[PDB]
Amino acid sequence: TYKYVNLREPSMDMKSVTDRAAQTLLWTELIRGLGMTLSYLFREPATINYPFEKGPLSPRFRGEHALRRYPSGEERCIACKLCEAVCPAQAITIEAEPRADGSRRTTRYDIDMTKCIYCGFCQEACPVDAIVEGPNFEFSTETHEELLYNKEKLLNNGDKWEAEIAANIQADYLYR
């Protein structure tokens, strides 16, 4: 249940001593290393052609956040504040009131994406699949406050990415 790395006493007969002296004087392991580097010279490189090729992702991927809707246009978030209760960065800020038809909806739904640790606890805490974390990772900004998302940005991300978000949830909801 254990093995000894580097507990080999070398053979001291003239054959092995001449082997090690030929290794010293004729640089045999150095030519071995040159041969291994030369072997990688003639391989096809592992380089993908970004942006025209994309790295492989799964339907579980945790990228940009989005607020979703039912298949009626009604937004799924019913202001229950589980996602900011579980948010380990406290990146989520929610206010709420009954809207004009008496429905429990949010007035504020902020996610500071620069506090956010992208761990998907909000999408697993959400009882109505409202907040999800979409597949978008190509959303670098040029200013810090463009990453301080309010509810309108998250609803636009939901409307923007729903055709993909719904298919990824369709692929992964039986594991959840």
Binding site: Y70, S72, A100, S103, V128, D129
Partner: protein, 95 residues
Amino acid sequence: GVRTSPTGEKVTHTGQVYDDEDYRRVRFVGRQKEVNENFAIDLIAEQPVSQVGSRVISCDGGGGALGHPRVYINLDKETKTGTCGYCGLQFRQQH
């Protein structure tokens, strides 16, 4: 269902708009106020009231485990429809 203040600024579905004398309109100067134009209170109002023949109906938002928790809606009031607390779809007992 976005409407517009007399300053030209769009109004969100919350009702938020900046005032005429509020300085914080300068953040949209040369840029845009991003609102979503699909108001949920207008979109759920377009769904027709579901006529059902039972005294109690259930709703889970469609999709089984993809919707919301399954709640049971009473329909004894004939004056008012029974509305889902999660999805806002509304129901009426047909008798």
